[PDB]
């Protein structure tokens, strides 16, 4: 996989963000995770966590996987990095997302994220409390 440039347009919630990618605005949905909706328990914390990561980043990058690059809603499907740190993994490691929506052929980082979930779960963090 390859990292490509993007710039923040605006945070949306724990697992979606609006970025400018190849000069076009698009909403990105984070691969392989599910944060609670803003209206649910840990939803505000998930939203906050992603907002902070992307707004503080000097460099945002998007990494597509091998499979579909947009979903049925026209959202980009990617791993999103803030100064080299992957938000997808970070939200899971913090107990602010569950590994979810693991579809064949867009699952390159599946093991890495499950390992993070196992550790968040061992620590009883947030969702796992
Ligand atoms: C993360 C992801 C979501 N989706 C679709 C599946 C779900 O369809 P449904 O809306 O029919 O439930 C939806 C969940 O996204 P959200 O968790 O943002 O609601 O997004 C994909 O198709 N591929 C993906 O990789
Ligand atoms: Ca969600």
UniProtKB/Swiss-Prot annotation:
Segments of this protein annotated with the region Disordered: 109-129
Q: Where in the cell is it found?
A: Secreted
- Provide the active-site residues from the annotation: 29, 37, 75
The Basic and acidic residues compositionally biased stretches are 109-125
Q: Where does Ca(2+) bind?
A: 15, 34-35
Q: What is this protein called?
A: Nuclease A
Give the species.
Staphylococcus aureus
**Gene giving rise to this polypeptide:** nuc
Residue window of the full protein shown: 89 to 223 of 231
């Amino acid at each position: 996989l390859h990292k490509e440039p993007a710039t923040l347009i605006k945070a949306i919630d724990g697992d979606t963000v609006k970025l400018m990618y190849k000069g076009q605005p698009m909403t990105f949905r984070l691969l392989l995770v599910d944060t609670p909706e803003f209206n649910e328990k840990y939803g505000p914390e998930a939203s906050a966590f992603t907002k902070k990561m992307v707004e503080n980043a000097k460099k945002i990058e998007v990494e597509f996987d091998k499979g579909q690059r947009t979903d049925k809603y026209g959202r980009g499907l990617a791993y999103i990095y803030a100064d080299g740190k992957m938000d997808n993994e970070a939200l899971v490691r913090q107990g602010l997302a569950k590994v979810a929506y693991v579809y064949k052929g867009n699952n390159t980082h599946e093991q890495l994220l499950r390992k993070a979930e196992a550790q968040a779960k061992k620590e009883k963090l947030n969702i796992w409390s």
